[PDB]
């Protein structure tokens, strides 16, 4: 029984909150360490932090912070004064002796944090751009629209992209208006 | 009465001749009760007690793969300290590791203890608080200081209050027909004429568990140390251990020496008198 | 039972 | 200081029964090494592992894979044969060895290998920049250029927009990765969107030049090629705009 | 530095001759652990020969226990011969019953 579960997929909060990550592990082993690492959209994998079983329950590095606890098999990540730069895929693991007595990792699946900025005056509108090649073809620009707002037939409609301000663009080949609802 | 349990490690180097030898052996009390051996076809942590065997499978899978974990960090250990002391790689060398804890007569935590030896000297030792480490040398000081940093004495004492005595006490009962039992010393008496003015008394204790015996002479009453020899306690190979003192006397009074045997499995303590 | 193998060597 | 974990291609494309070898170097002198693949719903399956100088053995996932470890400092992941459920994103990975347990896995930066039937489903991208609307300027005394690269597979491309012959990166903003264009298609290809606000004064100044470019990583010069439209290879396509009264 | 092994030679039972029992050889307090150990009768080499699993001391010296079945027969005389990089040349040591 080597397992560890992350049975939050995706999760979103608002810049500048608290942010919880849950992690549950399961194993016989007494001799395991824990991890988390970071995947930006970047796509890298950057180590942040291991827990070993005899540590103690709480570890803090700086914005971040832990909740070890053997009785739960629970080991969840929290992030204070959340950043966009926090944004990205975190995983949890954990590591055992191996049959050769080497140390060996068991990745949970991840989970999706984006951190959504606050806009303090939503000022919500729609351009038509033309493309600069007189191609007479163009794209519809919704920006500086509400973090809260995240809506998108033949019609390309992209996510948001936070630049402080949101900005999803759509395009299509024959609607400005009625595109994003 | 107080119990204990303890491990000894000791992995050799064999330069060309292949990977280090490692062999972990486990005691409670003096009894072991495990063992592993790198070079047996084996490849598993084997029972050495009757009152081990029952553990199931998964006891023994965890236990194989902790101990072989020590064992490969034991190999690059050698090759770190023979970095340390800048020694040639021609040269064979040995780092032991004992550790373990004490239990009270309450089944309590006493004490615990983890000490390790380069070329049977101490090479670092976990201090009684199990927070601090003694180094015995230069090549230890950088061990303790990384280890002060990994905050590795909270990883033994974790252990060492945790499991070790967690573990002791259920050895102590699964088998307890074995390691709570005492056998009492089973004591004779022998005389050899050395020279024609003096002789020597052997008082022998035998079959005795555990280990731990006192022997001592008096003359008229009077304890008497002066030509007197002890044995190392030997084992006899089926769980017991066996002792002998020996007093050297002039000839003809040999019936004012007695001999004294004190022993836990002993109400009183015994008293001998050569018998011709 | 055994220790957990040493996190970190010599 | 030190790389890491060093591991290239960091893009390739095959056709179906190719062979290529993603290569791995770590300049730690780490005793274990790995070779991961990420997928979708499946996080990080390990394909085959080394605890050692010449020491191969199997993961969860070995299966259409082989791997070498002639050195300590390198590790090869040989796919023999292609197929297109090998496409995914490969990380290698090391970790010290024995000498620290408590030591994590290292990972690389990861090769995207796209596996495909036919080198015919290959298209370069088509790049286009959008101009500021008016009504953006004279309500926000802003401009947002949209730049758009459309029909590209796979999904290979790395955008970047360039003012007055420089890289810039204040005001930027990239779709984290291309979406498809017909979701429903396995062979889809590919659009990515990006944006560049600027204050309109510097928008309206007609001695700025605005560039969007994306490099394509596509076919090889050694992958064959029969057909009227061009090689789609490994190249850069950009889209330009003046600044505009 | 280098520590010579203690030997003791001595039976598992009070030994009688034609009486089903076990020999023994204890070396102790020996560094380091590659030792050689053959127990003897009349001079020549028993084969049936086991041993305890290594282990060592407080002071760190390793000590061993070598057994074998045996009925003492009045008349065999058996020793232990040791051997170890201490020793110019191996060390026999007679076993001694009346002791």
Same mark, same amino acid.
């Given at each position: 029984?080597?397992?560890?579960?992350?049975?939050?997929?995706?999760?979103?909060?608002?810049?500048?909150?608290?942010?919880?990550?849950?992690?549950?592990?399961?194993?016989?082993?007494?001799?395991?360490?824990?991890?988390?690492?970071?995947?930006?959209?970047?796509?890298?994998?950057?180590?942040?932090?291991?827990?070993?079983?005899?540590?103690?329950?709480?570890?803090?590095?700086?914005?971040?912070?832990?909740?070890?606890?053997?009785?739960?098999?629970?080991?969840?990540?929290?992030?204070?004064?959340?950043?966009?730069?926090?944004?990205?895929?975190?995983?949890?693991?954990?590591?055992?002796?191996?049959?050769?007595?080497?140390?060996?990792?068991?990745?949970?699946?991840?989970?999706?944090?984006?951190?959504?900025?606050?806009?303090?005056?939503?000022?919500?509108?729609?351009?038509?751009?033309?493309?600069?090649?007189?191609?007479?073809?163009?794209?519809?620009?919704?920006?500086?629209?509400?973090?809260?707002?995240?809506?998108?037939?033949?019609?390309?409609?992209?996510?948001?992209?936070?630049?402080?301000?949101?900005?999803?663009?759509?395009?299509?080949?024959?609607?400005?208006?009625?595109?994003?609802? | 009465?107080?119990?204990?349990?303890?491990?000894?490690?000791?992995?050799?180097?064999?330069?060309?001749?292949?990977?280090?030898?490692?062999?972990?052996?486990?005691?409670?009390?003096?009894?072991?009760?495990?063992?592993?051996?790198?070079?047996?076809?084996?490849?598993?942590?084997?029972?050495?007690?009757?009152?081990?065997?029952?553990?199931?499978?998964?006891?023994?899978?965890?236990?194989?793969?902790?101990?072989?974990?020590?064992?490969?960090?034991?190999?690059?250990?050698?090759?770190?300290?023979?970095?340390?002391?800048?020694?040639?790689?021609?040269?064979?060398?040995?780092?032991?590791?004992?550790?373990?804890?004490?239990?009270?007569?309450?089944?309590?935590?006493?004490?615990?203890?983890?000490?390790?030896?380069?070329?049977?000297?101490?090479?670092?030792?976990?201090?009684?608080?199990?927070?601090?480490?003694?180094?015995?040398?230069?090549?230890?000081?950088?061990?303790?200081?990384?280890?002060?940093?990994?905050?590795?004495?909270?990883?033994?004492?974790?252990?060492?209050?945790?499991?070790?005595?967690?573990?002791?006490?259920?050895?102590?009962?699964?088998?307890?027909?074995?390691?709570?039992?005492?056998?009492?010393?089973?004591?004779?008496?022998?005389?050899?004429?050395?020279?024609?003015?003096?002789?020597?008394?052997?008082?022998?204790?035998?079959?005795?568990?555990?280990?731990?015996?006192?022997?001592?002479?008096?003359?008229?009453?009077?304890?008497?140390?002066?030509?007197?020899?002890?044995?190392?306690?030997?084992?006899?190979?089926?769980?017991?251990?066996?002792?002998?003192?020996?007093?050297?006397?002039?000839?003809?009074?040999?019936?004012?020496?007695?001999?004294?045997?004190?022993?836990?499995?002993?109400?009183?303590?015994?008293?001998?008198?050569?018998?011709? | 039972?055994?220790?957990?193998?040493?996190?970190?060597?010599? | 200081?030190?790389?890491?974990?060093?591991?290239?291609?960091?893009?390739?494309?095959?056709?179906?029964?190719?062979?290529?070898?993603?290569?791995?170097?770590?300049?730690?002198?780490?005793?274990?090494?790995?070779?991961?693949?990420?997928?979708?719903?499946?996080?990080?399956?390990?394909?085959?592992?080394?605890?050692?100088?010449?020491?191969?053995?199997?993961?969860?996932?070995?299966?259409?894979?082989?791997?070498?470890?002639?050195?300590?400092?390198?590790?090869?992941?040989?796919?023999?044969?292609?197929?297109?459920?090998?496409?995914?994103?490969?990380?290698?990975?090391?970790?010290?060895?024995?000498?620290?347990?408590?030591?994590?896995?290292?990972?690389?930066?990861?090769?995207?290998? +796209?596996?495909?039937? @036919?080198?015919?489903?290959? %298209?370069?991208?088509? $790049?286009?920049?959008?101009?500021? *609307? =008016?009504?953006?300027?004279?309500?926000?005394?802003?401009?947002?250029?949209?730049?758009?690269?459309?029909?590209?597979?796979?999904?290979?491309?790395?955008?970047?927009?360039?003012?007055?012959?420089?890289?810039?990166?204040?005001?930027?903003?990239?779709?984290?990765?291309?979406?498809?264009?017909?979701?429903?298609?396995?062979?889809?290809?590919?659009?990515?969107?990006?944006?560049?606000?600027?204050?309109? +004064?510097?928008?309206? @100044?007609?001695?700025?030049? %605005?560039?969007?470019? $994306?490099?394509?990583?596509?076919? *090889? =010069?050694?992958?064959?090629?029969?057909?009227?439209?061009?090689?789609?290879?490994?190249?850069?396509?950009?889209?330009?705009?003046?600044?505009?009264? | 530095?280098?520590?010579?092994?203690?030997?003791?030679?001595?039976?598992?039972?009070?030994?009688?001759?034609?009486?089903?029992?076990?020999?023994?050889?204890?070396?102790?307090?020996?560094?380091?652990?590659?030792?050689?150990?053959?127990?003897?009768?009349?001079?020549?080499?028993?084969?049936?020969?086991?041993?305890?699993?290594?282990?060592?001391?407080?002071?760190?010296?390793?000590?061993?226990?070598?057994?074998?079945?045996?009925?003492?027969?009045?008349?065999?005389?058996?020793?232990?011969?040791?051997?170890?990089?201490?020793?110019?040349?191996?060390?026999?040591?007679?076993?001694?019953?009346?002791?």
């Amino acid at each position: 029984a080597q397992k560890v579960t992350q049975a939050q997929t995706e999760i979103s909060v608002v810049e500048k909150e608290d942010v919880t990550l849950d992690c549950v592990y399961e194993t016989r082993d007494t001799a395991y360490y824990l991890f988390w690492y970071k995947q930006p959209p970047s796509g890298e994998l950057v180590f942040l932090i291991r827990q070993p079983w005899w540590g103690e329950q709480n570890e803090i590095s700086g914005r971040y912070s832990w909740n070890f606890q053997k009785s739960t098999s629970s080991f969840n990540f929290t992030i204070t004064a959340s950043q966009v730069v926090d944004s990205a895929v975190y995983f949890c693991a954990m590591s055992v002796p191996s049959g050769d007595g080497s140390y060996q990792f068991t990745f949970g699946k991840g989970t999706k944090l984006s951190v959504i900025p606050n806009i303090q005056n939503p000022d919500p509108a729609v351009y038509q751009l033309r493309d600069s090649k007189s191609s007479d073809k163009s794209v519809c620009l919704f920006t500086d629209f509400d973090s809260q707002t995240n809506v998108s037939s033949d019609v390309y409609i992209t996510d948001k992209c936070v630049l402080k301000s949101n900005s999803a663009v759509a395009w299509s080949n024959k609607a400005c208006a009625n595109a994003f609802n | 009465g107080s119990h204990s349990m303890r491990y000894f490690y000791t992995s050799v180097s064999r330069p060309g001749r292949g990977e280090p030898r490692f062999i972990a052996v486990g005691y409670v009390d003096d009894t072991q009760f495990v063992r592993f051996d790198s070079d047996a076809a084996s490849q598993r942590m084997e029972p050495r007690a009757p009152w081990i065997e029952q553990e199931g499978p998964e006891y023994w899978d965890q236990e194989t793969r902790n101990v072989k974990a020590q064992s490969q960090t034991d190999r690059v250990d050698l090759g770190t300290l023979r970095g340390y002391y800048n020694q040639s790689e021609d040269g064979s060398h040995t780092i032991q590791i004992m550790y373990g804890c004490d239990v009270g007569p309450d089944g309590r935590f006493l004490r615990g203890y983890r000490q390790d030896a380069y070329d049977g000297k101490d090479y670092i030792a976990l201090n009684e608080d199990l927070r601090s480490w003694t180094a015995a040398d230069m090549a230890a000081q950088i061990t303790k200081r990384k280890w002060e940093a990994a905050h590795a004495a909270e990883q033994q004492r974790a252990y060492l209050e945790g499991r070790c005595v967690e573990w002791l006490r259920r050895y102590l009962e699964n088998g307890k027909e074995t390691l709570q039992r005492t056998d009492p010393p089973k004591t004779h008496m022998t005389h050899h004429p050395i020279s024609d003015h003096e002789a020597t008394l052997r008082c022998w204790a035998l079959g005795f568990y555990p280990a731990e015996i006192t022997l001592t002479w008096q003359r008229d009453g009077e304890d008497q140390t002066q030509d007197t020899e002890l044995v190392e306690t030997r084992p006899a190979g089926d769980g017991t251990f066996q002792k002998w003192a020996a007093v050297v006397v002039p000839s003809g009074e040999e019936q004012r020496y007695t001999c004294h045997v004190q022993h836990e499995g002993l109400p009183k303590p015994l008293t001998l008198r050569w018998e011709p | 039972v055994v220790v957990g193998a040493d996190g970190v060597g010599k | 200081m030190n790389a890491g974990v060093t591991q290239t291609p960091k893009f390739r494309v095959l056709k179906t029964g190719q062979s290529m070898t993603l290569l791995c170097a770590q300049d730690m002198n780490h005793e274990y090494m790995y070779w991961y693949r990420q997928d979708p719903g499946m996080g990080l399956r390990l394909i085959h592992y080394s605890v050692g100088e010449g020491t191969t053995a199997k993961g969860e996932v070995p299966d259409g894979y082989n791997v070498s470890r002639l050195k300590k400092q390198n590790f090869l992941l040989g796919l023999e044969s292609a197929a297109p459920s090998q496409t995914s994103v490969y990380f290698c990975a090391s970790k010290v060895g024995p000498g620290q347990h408590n030591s994590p896995l290292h990972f690389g930066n990861g090769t995207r290998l +796209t596996v495909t039937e @036919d080198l015919n489903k290959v %298209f370069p991208p088509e $790049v286009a920049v959008f101009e500021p *609307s =008016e009504a953006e300027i004279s309500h926000t005394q802003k401009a947002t250029l949209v730049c758009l690269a459309t029909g590209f597979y796979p999904d290979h491309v790395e955008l970047s927009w360039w003012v007055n012959g420089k890289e810039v990166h204040s005001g930027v903003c990239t779709d984290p990765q291309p979406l498809k264009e017909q979701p429903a298609l396995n062979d889809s290809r590919y659009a990515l969107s990006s944006r560049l606000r600027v204050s309109a +004064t510097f928008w309206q @100044d007609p001695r700025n030049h %605005f560039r969007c470019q $994306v490099q394509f990583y596509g076919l *090889s =010069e050694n992958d064959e090629w029969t057909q009227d439209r061009a090689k789609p290879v490994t190249q850069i396509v950009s889209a330009e705009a003046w600044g505009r009264a | 530095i280098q520590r010579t092994p203690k030997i003791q030679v001595y039976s598992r039972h009070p030994a009688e001759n034609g009486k089903s029992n076990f020999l023994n050889c204890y070396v102790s307090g020996f560094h380091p652990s590659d030792i050689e150990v053959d127990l003897l009768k009349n001079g020549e080499r028993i084969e049936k020969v086991e041993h305890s699993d290594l282990s060592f001391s407080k002071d760190w010296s390793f000590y061993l226990l070598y057994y074998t079945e045996f009925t003492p027969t009045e008349k065999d005389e058996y020793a232990c011969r040791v051997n170890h990089v201490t020793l110019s040349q191996p060390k026999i040591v007679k076993w001694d019953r009346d002791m």
